Amino acid sequence: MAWNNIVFYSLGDVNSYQGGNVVITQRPQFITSWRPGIATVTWNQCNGPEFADGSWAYYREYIAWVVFPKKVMTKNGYPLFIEVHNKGSWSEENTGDNDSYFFLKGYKWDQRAFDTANLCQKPGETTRLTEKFDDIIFKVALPADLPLGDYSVTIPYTSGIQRHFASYLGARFKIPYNVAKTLPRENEMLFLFKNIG
Numbered sequence: 001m002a003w004n005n006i007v008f009y010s011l012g013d014v015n016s017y018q019g020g021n022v023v024i025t026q027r028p029q030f031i032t033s034w035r036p037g038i039a040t041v042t043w044n045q046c047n048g049p050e051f052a053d054g055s056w057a058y059y060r061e062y063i064a065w066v067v068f069p070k071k072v073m074t075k076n077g078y079p080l081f082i083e084v085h086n087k088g089s090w091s092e093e094n095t096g097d098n099d100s101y102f103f104l105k106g107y108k109w110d111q112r113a114f115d116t117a118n119l120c121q122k123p124g125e126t127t128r129l130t131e132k133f134d135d136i137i138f139k140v141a142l143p144a145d146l147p148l149g150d151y152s153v154t155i156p157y158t159s160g161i162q163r164h165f166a167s168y169l170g171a172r173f174k175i176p177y178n179v180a181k182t183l184p185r186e187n188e189m190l191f192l193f194k195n196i197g
């Protein structure tokens with residue numbers, strides 16, 4: 001029987017970004033950098049062998065994901081609107097979604113391999129990821145009634161790699177958008193800025 005194993009390796013990093021002194025008519029930017037580091041499995045769906053011993057072939061399909069909020073609330077109760085300034089070569093998909101951006105990069109498919117490998121790692125397992133992808137530059141629209149002062153805003157988001165191992169050539173699987181939207185947001189961007197007059 002034909003089999004498919006899909007595992008999502010989630011990256012979890014905390015970082016800060018200084019947007020500086022801004023007036024409400026301006027759009028301060030922040031850069032989301034793809035940082036290689038320790039990834040944790042947060043989702044899987046498998047019906048095949050959990051381990052390839054090196055004696056038989058399987059096929060690889062890898063897709064990098066960034067799932068970013070379109071809006072965030074300040075501690076004092078105001079909305080900040082997250083907009084795309086520069087998404088490089090990322091594929092911006094499911095654009096009609098009200099709450100989140102979905103950025104994908106499908107960089108490996110139909111690749112036959114024999115390499116000994118863990119084909120279905122379980123939620124909570126960890127591994128080092130060293131892959132590199134484009135920065136994503138965002139711009140923030142401040143509401144005209146935002147109170148003046150210093151802001152320190154936590155922006156949680158998801159990033160990681162979906163690895164799809166299959167028994168056959170031509171295998172294709174994408175984590176459904178409704179699932180991607182609910183993957184734990186393990187990264188944090190602490191956005192700093194001062195609303196001036």
Ligand SMILES: CC(=O)N[C@H]1[C@H](O[C@H]2[C@@H](O)[C@@H](CO)O[C@H](O[C@@H]3[C@H](O)[C@@H](O)[C@H](O[C@H]4[C@H](O)[C@@H](O)[C@H](O)O[C@@H]4CO)O[C@@H]3CO)[C@@H]2O)O[C@H](CO)[C@H](O)[C@@H]1O[C@@H]1O[C@H](CO)[C@H](O)[C@H](O[C@]2(C(=O)O)C[C@H](O)[C@@H](NC(C)=O)[C@H]([C@H](O)[C@H](O)CO)O2)[C@H]1O
Pocket residue numbers: 061062063091092093104105106107108109172174
């Ligand atoms: C899910 C899917 O398969 N395609 C999505 C597409 O998914 C991509 C995308 O997310 C990228 C992001 O980087 O990653 C993967 O793609 C990888 C590579 O990037 C990509 O370059 C690579 O392309 C290969 C391909 O694998 C080879 O088969 C091909 O021969 O060569 C190229 C390389 O040059 O593939 C990699 C695979 O890992 C993801 O898979 O995302 C987009 C939008 O962002 C869409 O969501 C794609 O899905 C389709 O969209 C169109 C409409 O917009 C249709 O709905 C289409 O459906 C069919 C269908 O109805 O069944 C598929 C049929 O095959 C097609 N029939 C043909 C061409 O005869 C029909 C047809 O066009 C009819 O008009 C519609 O009925 O559409 C969806 O599959």
Ligand SMILES: [Zn+2]
Pocket residue numbers: 085086
């Ligand atoms: Zn620019």
Ligand SMILES: [Zn+2]
Pocket residue numbers: 143145
């Ligand atoms: Zn308001």
